[PDB]
Scaffold this active site. Structure first.
Site, PDB file in Angstrom:
ATOM      1  N   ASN A  62      -2.645  -0.099  -1.656  1.00 48.67           N
ATOM      2  CA  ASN A  62      -3.899  -0.798  -1.371  1.00 48.67           C
ATOM      3  C   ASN A  62      -4.866   0.327  -1.761  1.00 48.67           C
ATOM      4  O   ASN A  62      -5.028   1.300  -1.007  1.00 48.67           O
ATOM      5  CB  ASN A  62      -3.927  -1.117   0.131  1.00 48.67           C
ATOM      6  CG  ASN A  62      -5.035  -2.091   0.535  1.00 48.67           C
ATOM      7  OD1 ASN A  62      -5.334  -2.227   1.735  1.00 48.67           O
ATOM      8  ND2 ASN A  62      -5.639  -2.778  -0.443  1.00 48.67           N
ATOM      9  N   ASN A 104      -5.502   0.450   5.864  1.00 47.44           N
ATOM     10  CA  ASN A 104      -5.060   1.383   4.843  1.00 47.44           C
ATOM     11  C   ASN A 104      -6.271   2.218   4.450  1.00 47.44           C
ATOM     12  O   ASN A 104      -6.158   3.418   4.180  1.00 47.44           O
ATOM     13  CB  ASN A 104      -4.523   0.647   3.608  1.00 47.44           C
ATOM     14  CG  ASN A 104      -3.253  -0.113   3.897  1.00 47.44           C
ATOM     15  OD1 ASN A 104      -2.352   0.404   4.553  1.00 47.44           O
ATOM     16  ND2 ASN A 104      -3.168  -1.350   3.400  1.00 47.44           N
ATOM     17  N   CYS A 164      -1.698  -4.238   3.659  1.00 44.20           N
ATOM     18  CA  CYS A 164      -2.910  -4.476   4.466  1.00 44.20           C
ATOM     19  C   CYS A 164      -2.590  -3.957   5.877  1.00 44.20           C
ATOM     20  O   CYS A 164      -1.711  -4.493   6.547  1.00 44.20           O
ATOM     21  CB  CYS A 164      -3.242  -5.964   4.550  1.00 44.20           C
ATOM     22  SG  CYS A 164      -4.781  -6.224   5.462  1.00 44.20           S
ATOM     23  N   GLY A 165      -3.298  -2.917   6.304  1.00 43.01           N
ATOM     24  CA  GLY A 165      -3.072  -2.337   7.621  1.00 43.01           C
ATOM     25  C   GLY A 165      -3.539  -3.209   8.777  1.00 43.01           C
ATOM     26  O   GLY A 165      -2.835  -3.303   9.797  1.00 43.01           O
ATOM     27  N   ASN A 209     -15.177  -5.561  -0.054  1.00 40.23           N
ATOM     28  CA  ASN A 209     -13.948  -6.060  -0.720  1.00 40.23           C
ATOM     29  C   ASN A 209     -14.236  -6.080  -2.232  1.00 40.23           C
ATOM     30  O   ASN A 209     -15.398  -5.995  -2.656  1.00 40.23           O
ATOM     31  CB  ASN A 209     -13.630  -7.502  -0.293  1.00 40.23           C
ATOM     32  CG  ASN A 209     -12.947  -7.594   1.056  1.00 40.23           C
ATOM     33  OD1 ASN A 209     -12.025  -6.833   1.350  1.00 40.23           O
ATOM     34  ND2 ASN A 209     -13.369  -8.566   1.874  1.00 40.23           N
ATOM     35  N   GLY A 248      -3.711  -6.298   8.604  1.00 38.81           N
ATOM     36  CA  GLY A 248      -2.787  -7.418   8.542  1.00 38.81           C
ATOM     37  C   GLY A 248      -1.454  -7.104   9.214  1.00 38.81           C
ATOM     38  O   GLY A 248      -0.909  -7.953   9.923  1.00 38.81           O
ATOM     39  N   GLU A 280      -5.105 -11.577   0.954  1.00 34.97           N
ATOM     40  CA  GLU A 280      -6.305 -11.114   1.659  1.00 34.97           C
ATOM     41  C   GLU A 280      -7.567 -11.858   1.278  1.00 34.97           C
ATOM     42  O   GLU A 280      -7.775 -12.241   0.123  1.00 34.97           O
ATOM     43  CB  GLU A 280      -6.586  -9.640   1.383  1.00 34.97           C
ATOM     44  CG  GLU A 280      -5.593  -8.648   1.959  1.00 34.97           C
ATOM     45  CD  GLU A 280      -6.090  -7.210   1.810  1.00 34.97           C
ATOM     46  OE1 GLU A 280      -5.237  -6.313   1.634  1.00 34.97           O
ATOM     47  OE2 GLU A 280      -7.329  -6.983   1.870  1.00 34.97           O
ATOM     48  N   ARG A 281      -8.426 -12.016   2.282  1.00 32.08           N
ATOM     49  CA  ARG A 281      -9.732 -12.606   2.083  1.00 32.08           C
ATOM     50  C   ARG A 281     -10.439 -11.666   1.123  1.00 32.08           C
ATOM     51  O   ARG A 281     -10.415 -10.449   1.307  1.00 32.08           O
ATOM     52  CB  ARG A 281     -10.500 -12.641   3.404  1.00 32.08           C
ATOM     53  CG  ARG A 281     -11.966 -13.007   3.260  1.00 32.08           C
ATOM     54  CD  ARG A 281     -12.661 -13.048   4.630  1.00 32.08           C
ATOM     55  NE  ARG A 281     -12.733 -11.735   5.273  1.00 32.08           N
ATOM     56  CZ  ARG A 281     -13.359 -11.511   6.433  1.00 32.08           C
ATOM     57  NH1 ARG A 281     -13.963 -12.521   7.071  1.00 32.08           N
ATOM     58  NH2 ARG A 281     -13.384 -10.287   6.951  1.00 32.08           N
ATOM     59  N   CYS A 292     -10.583  -1.991   7.890  1.00 33.09           N
ATOM     60  CA  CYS A 292      -9.521  -1.891   6.880  1.00 33.09           C
ATOM     61  C   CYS A 292      -8.615  -0.747   7.298  1.00 33.09           C
ATOM     62  O   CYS A 292      -9.046   0.399   7.325  1.00 33.09           O
ATOM     63  CB  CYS A 292     -10.112  -1.678   5.484  1.00 33.09           C
ATOM     64  SG  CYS A 292      -8.848  -1.285   4.243  1.00 33.09           S
ATOM     65  N   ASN A 295     -11.498  -8.255  11.737  1.00 31.53           N
ATOM     66  CA  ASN A 295     -11.455  -9.230  10.638  1.00 31.53           C
ATOM     67  C   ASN A 295     -10.424 -10.294  11.033  1.00 31.53           C
ATOM     68  O   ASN A 295      -9.538 -10.036  11.857  1.00 31.53           O
ATOM     69  CB  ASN A 295     -11.166  -8.541   9.270  1.00 31.53           C
ATOM     70  CG  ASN A 295      -9.883  -7.712   9.253  1.00 31.53           C
ATOM     71  OD1 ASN A 295      -9.316  -7.387  10.293  1.00 31.53           O
ATOM     72  ND2 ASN A 295      -9.430  -7.347   8.041  1.00 31.53           N
ATOM     73  N   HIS A 326      -7.243 -12.986  10.856  1.00 27.50           N
ATOM     74  CA  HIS A 326      -5.911 -13.061  10.291  1.00 27.50           C
ATOM     75  C   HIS A 326      -5.238 -14.351  10.746  1.00 27.50           C
ATOM     76  O   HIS A 326      -5.342 -14.775  11.907  1.00 27.50           O
ATOM     77  CB  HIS A 326      -5.066 -11.848  10.716  1.00 27.50           C
ATOM     78  CG  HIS A 326      -5.613 -10.549  10.227  1.00 27.50           C
ATOM     79  ND1 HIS A 326      -5.291 -10.026   8.996  1.00 27.50           N
ATOM     80  CD2 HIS A 326      -6.560  -9.730  10.750  1.00 27.50           C
ATOM     81  CE1 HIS A 326      -6.021  -8.945   8.775  1.00 27.50           C
ATOM     82  NE2 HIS A 326      -6.801  -8.747   9.822  1.00 27.50           N
TER      83      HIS A 326
HETATM   84  C1  LIG Z   1      -8.086  -2.719   3.437  1.00 31.56           C
HETATM   85  C2  LIG Z   1      -7.380  -3.784   4.311  1.00 31.56           C
HETATM   86  N1  LIG Z   1      -6.428  -4.475   3.358  1.00 31.56           N
HETATM   87  C3  LIG Z   1      -8.386  -4.839   4.846  1.00 31.56           C
HETATM   88  C4  LIG Z   1      -9.502  -5.252   3.847  1.00 31.56           C
HETATM   89  C5  LIG Z   1     -10.435  -6.319   4.435  1.00 31.56           C
HETATM   90  C6  LIG Z   1      -9.900  -7.761   4.255  1.00 31.56           C
HETATM   91  N2  LIG Z   1      -9.711  -8.077   2.824  1.00 31.56           N
HETATM   92  C7  LIG Z   1     -10.879  -8.722   4.861  1.00 31.56           C
HETATM   93  O1  LIG Z   1     -11.676  -9.357   4.124  1.00 31.56           O
HETATM   94  O2  LIG Z   1     -10.890  -8.889   6.117  1.00 31.56           O
HETATM   95  C8  LIG Z   1      -6.533  -3.169   5.442  1.00 31.56           C
HETATM   96  O3  LIG Z   1      -6.683  -3.515   6.660  1.00 31.56           O
HETATM   97  O4  LIG Z   1      -5.698  -2.324   5.095  1.00 31.56           O
END
Ligand SMILES: C[C@](N)(CCC[C@H](N)C(=O)O)C(=O)O
Ligand SMILES: C[C@](N)(CCC[C@H](N)C(=O)O)C(=O)O
Ligand SMILES: C[C@](N)(CCC[C@H](N)C(=O)O)C(=O)O
Ligand SMILES: C[C@](N)(CCC[C@H](N)C(=O)O)C(=O)O
Ligand SMILES: C[C@](N)(CCC[C@H](N)C(=O)O)C(=O)O
Ligand SMILES: C[C@](N)(CCC[C@H](N)C(=O)O)C(=O)O
Lengths: 288, 287, 287, 301, 287, 301
Positions: free
Chosen positions: B13, B77, B230-231, B66, B233, B221-222, B75, B164, B166
């Site tokens: 990522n 990662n 995605c961390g 993003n 996530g 991912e959004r 985020c 964010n 999920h």
């Molecule tokens: C960088 C990330 N992938 C999250 C990015 C933000 C995600 N795309 C969103 O729109 O919430 C993570 O948590 O590691």
């Protein structure tokens, strides 16, 4: 280690350009190039292009490594970026042309007033054995609209080399015209790329004729995959379109990333390709 | 019209990190970030992360855009990359931890002795309205293994926010377990991302349970698509696995680019995420 | 009048660079250069370097005045600054090499990827009377580890010219190795600089061998004193170390201001010197 | 080359400082027009780098012309070449006066009021071009100098013993906003031949002495006549400079207090002479000397 | 559409400069340029100058439209602005010179140390029919201090072309020297500008000799009126002053907006003009 | 070249002003978004420099859109090209309205309340895109115009004698916040052919006349019909402009007071026509005319 470079793209076909004018040997290995081209773990690019010292009188020489590490013999979008790169290094403003030694022979890009680059891509190679392809020539030693069985399905293809090999198809044998955007390149592409009839593998261009002077295409490149554009490919498919009697010698070719103006001059048999080239960022990458 | 940055990636990522400690305003616009994130016409990245001045006492603040230009609230990662970036910029060696203000609240990464980054990702948000989702809570105020009709097909999902949103699914309603590698993310992903039940869009995690302490996942991912990891996530899907009774609070999560160690501590309700982060190159991009 | 210039330094050997591409005659006199080089009453520098028009096909020519006003025939740290100065005036980017005509003959600097400059310093001159020195050659036509009586004390010295004269010593005759930092340069330096055995005066390098590929040195320059570095001096002392059998042809030379990489190539007899060069400020001085 | 994201980001984050170089008897400074703000345009760390003579512009200090304070025409702040911020500078304020006169197209005699860390200072360009400065009144109370030495003449430290590296020297302490330790020789010793002193060796021992909490400037004096003094100075944070105006003022005060010279003296410093007068009428000290522009430019930060 | 430009002035002769380096076709029409030059309804300027691609080897080409929309063959104040515009666009530092193709042939401006621009304005054209003028040559083929009847009044004039036509007068036939500030230019100017003896119209310079190396002038320009300065005019009037034996080849010319240094070198017949050029603002105009 | 530290430092490109250029019938202005403060972003001296047509941007004035005062939507301040600050500007407020509509992406009919030195002014963008403005009520009391001329018709100065450089003219005085001196000819003289007047010659004599303490704008009028007036104007601090909205309002008031025209008139100005109406019902004056954006830019300060 550290590799200094400048990122450029020609219609979205993006490259890592390195100033290698101080040596006849590339600053990095093919293995390092493949790592650097990884888009998430590396710099990300369709290839690495080296500006090297001239050979037998040319102003410079160009060598390129595909993102898979293999070394192809030429690259049209890349040579347009190469000309702009040299101009930036030597403060050359406006129109300027350079002679470049490549694996395909002499290539002569000329920067235009608007910043695009018009390139003399040399003459096409049609003799089957030199493309190279194991398909038998069916029009002299040229392979034109010949049958190629791909995973048990009969396609008709024309083969032409611009130093590197190209397999151009306008559709399956006994089939209708193609709607290239409907093709599943990741699926069909590899079947052409590694086909037993192409000893050195091949680039493959799928073409949709819009008019005798306007062609639409998608390409699955040897060692690089489904790129946004391929200059040698655009040149090869116009040659193929002319040989198959589907278009004239001057065409606008629409590639995923944009258009190129191609002309296969009957007067000298040379092919001219005109298109843009743009610098994106300057950088230094960690070498392993 | 030039941005100086350093490229990092956390399990693939990848991000463009910029030193924005000298201002409270991000150095570039969301539109410029989207262009810079284009992989063929720009630098190429899943996002742009800014290291900004601390807020209300934190050592620093982090803001991220993003690759589609939208601004998510956290985020995982990315914050591990943020930690390496700061240590690089401040010449900090060995174990170090910083408090970071984010849109998800306080986040505290700590570089471990072994070099990995263990991050206190805060506490999960489960109240449906705050995720946010229009789905009705079926386990208290939380949405757990509830029906979501996606393009006419019934899926069961669990919703959790890490700042964010999920949407986690272990399969269709009344369906077998998933073999996540068989999913066609470019096809199914957008249908979850822009679903009418997710007002602010959502990140979606597809999960395959290997054991009660080992989960395999893929994510759409959004605003970023099918990323390698995605961390936030990985943290949210462990919360979902626990809520659905499929796994324990401590799990190894296998993401496309690699593994992350996740632990949702019952002791304080905080989730801890440990993973790598590596610099790749640096440069200056034309704006 | 007003002199426009750019201040640069190569390992702390600092110079006033002037664009003199307009004329074959230096824009200021030697007397004016000496005044400008005064550190408290003038701009302050070890010398003034002029970028002049090419001679017999070279890209450019370089002339330099020492801070005492005398005109030496070359300067290594200075030519590295010269290359970066010209690259700027020509709007060149990246690697570039230039052919420069100097009092020492052709010199060819080449800007490197890291901004450093690798210079083809030409071949060393070892014939005693051409150095020039009045000392008798004791090894072929060269003066190698020969006795020089300085203020009644016997030192052993090796003489070599890089266009300009150099007197290199690794210690007194029949004495132990030197700890160069223990020397009192302001005291001993002038005695070598103005010695009767050096008709055109000489630069003097005091050397401490750390290994066969690592030398430490201090220098008392003709017309400039105890500078932080001297490129022609670093080249000359490696030649001397090789001739005396104390070191290999490729060495790292530690000078007060920093290290230089020197290689006296056996293949062509040319000496290559690589080191940094940095712009400091742009100015206009009263004449 | 080593892959270094840190080094890389520093390099592209370069700023620029426009300035004019002046010197007062060889005590040279980087003058900057900071009339647009109450905060110095550069940090003390940046000033120390710019003052490096081989790697920077080269100077004994950086002087900022700032907006006036509580009335005054202007304010002056200065950073020593080591980056520390002293309270005043005599050679510097004469350069400051020329700088202002140049910036404001002021010809002929002109006087300005300047706010400094030492209080009100009033330079006045003379008809003959030299700058005569009202340096204010000297501070003699020991603890305000500051020095931990006990006042031995009222609250003042006059010809008192100071043990420097085990050797007994006699010193007089006086402040001109900044601290000064003046000596005419060792306790029970002969007069000094200042040019015979090894300043780099003895200077630091006085500068960082435990009896001077904020460090001190040190002036070594040789009396030539009751109206003519010769000196060398080791300055706090600047070293062996060619001249020090606050120092020349302080040593005349010291000479008067020790009964060795009159209140009107010509002081010979390495870089040249200064006319000093400690007026009994108002207790103020007046310093007259030159100041000259040398070059101007723009330095990378 | 919209036109992006930078406003510059050379001694008050002000212009709209446009970057037209991508094409040999000016970005706007002559009619649009006339509208943009209107001071109350447009941007306001004495002309629009385009920086275009080089021709037959020159670095660049320059084309200009007067505020009335006509296209003259050169402009001295404008080429000095052109040189600074290129330096700004290319971020060039220090002394730089450029070869420019113009309707008058090759012109070579060079940015000086002090920021002024010294320009090689080419050679003067004196053959009457090439000026062009219908007056008969009275000095070889040149028209020098010849009778021109303007609205029934006899003036003596000298004609010279700098690519563009110039009619220079030091007074009426059989009249005293002029006090140029006493002239009513809006009244007398148009009578010269559109005179039947000038097929392509003409620029007119009224001159007052202060000394053999110092001239004062006012100008009524073809298509632009009473401007604050004209570089081609200042070059032409020095040529005329020399031909009439009133001044020497090197003169300071005082124009309404300030002075220009002019020298007509006998060594090569070229005229050099040195003067200032300054950027005022930049903007985007509605088309 | 002369060594000049002053020139060098000046040449260090201080700041930048972002603005949009507009014109109302050729009366052109530099409009600046100053909504973030009650203080104008530039000084009057800077405005005068920017208004220079050859050395600056070029304009008849600089207009600032400022924050509302006492509930008005906005406030407007303007500096003439000579740097003076007048209390209102008609062509300017029409440009102001379009400037706001642009900054607020307002479409169609819209009206805003603007606080000015003349009091409340209310512009309204019409359907055709023109702008009709409520210019408030005219001030006729002699001393409030202000003028030193004695009221000869109530407290108003109507067709009264004004000796200009020894020549007797008849003038009417009216204020629209700013002062206006309107004349239809010399005392005992014929009607005027305004195009035959030498404004640069006669204009300044009225502008700086001793009878106008704050100077005055002057309108020369030629009556074409009772509802059609032709005029030329010499503005206080701006000169012979192509149009003046406050002036067109004041001259219709004057024409009515002298019995030469009706309350509704079409006024022909050099740059074009304006529709003016002095509503008897409320004593308010309404001015309708165009306003166009020309370009936008950033000027060096
Ligand atoms: C960088 C990330 N992938 C999250 C990015 C933000 C995600 N795309 C969103 O729109 O919430 C993570 O948590 O590691
Ligand atoms: C860069 C390129 N796409 C060609 C790349 C080389 C190609 N992948 C090959 O393996 O022959 C072009 O011709 O534009
Ligand atoms: C600049 C220089 N130190 C040489 C300066 C010239 C030297 N002082 C001499 O008189 O020969 C170098 O070689 O780097
Ligand atoms: C500039 C100065 N030499 C004083 C500088 C300040 C001094 N180094 C200190 O630290 O007090 C003077 O008074 O002339
Ligand atoms: C710009 C200019 N004034 C010349 C403009 C061209 C002139 N108006 C003409 O019509 O020849 C100059 O030479 O400086
Ligand atoms: C802008 C304006 N011409 C008035 C400007 C102000 C006038 N110059 C004055 O000083 O009163 C108008 O009313 O339209």
């Amino acid at each position: 280690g550290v590799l200094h470079f400048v990122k450029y793209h020609g219609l979205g076909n993006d490259f890592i350009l390195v100033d290698n004018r101080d040596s006849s040997e590339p600053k990095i290995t093919q293995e390092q190039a493949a790592k650097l081209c990884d888009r998430n773990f590396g710099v990300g690019a369709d290839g690495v292009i080296f500006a090297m010292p001239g050979v037998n009188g040319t102003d410079y020489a160009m060598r390129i490594f595909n993102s898979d590490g293999s070394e192809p013999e030429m690259c049209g979008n890349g040579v347009r970026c190469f000309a702009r790169f040299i101009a930036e290094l030597e403060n050359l403003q406006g129109k300027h042309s350079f002679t470049i030694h490549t694996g395909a022979g002499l290539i002569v890009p000329e920067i235009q007033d608007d910043g695009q680059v018009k390139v003399d891509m040399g003459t096409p190679i049609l003799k089957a054995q030199d493309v190279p392809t194991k398909l038998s020539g069916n029009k002299g030693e040229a392979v034109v609209e010949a049958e190629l069985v791909v995973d048990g399905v009969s396609w008709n293809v024309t083969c032409v080399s611009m130093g590197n090999p190209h397999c151009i198809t306008f559709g399956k044998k006994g089939g209708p015209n193609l709607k290239v955007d409907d093709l599943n390149l990741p699926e069909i592409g590899p079947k052409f790329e590694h086909h037993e009839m192409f000893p050195a593998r091949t680039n493959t261009e799928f073409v949709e004729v819009l008019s005798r002077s306007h062609l639409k295409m998608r390409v699955w490149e040897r060692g690089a995959g489904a790129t946004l554009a391929c200059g040698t490919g655009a040149c090869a498919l116009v040659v193929a379109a002319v040989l198959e009697g589907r278009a004239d010698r001057k065409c606008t070719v629409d590639l995923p990333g944009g258009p190129l103006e191609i002309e296969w001059k009957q007067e000298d048999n040379h092919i001219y390709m005109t298109g843009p080239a743009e610098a994106v960022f300057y950088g230094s990458a960690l070498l392993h």
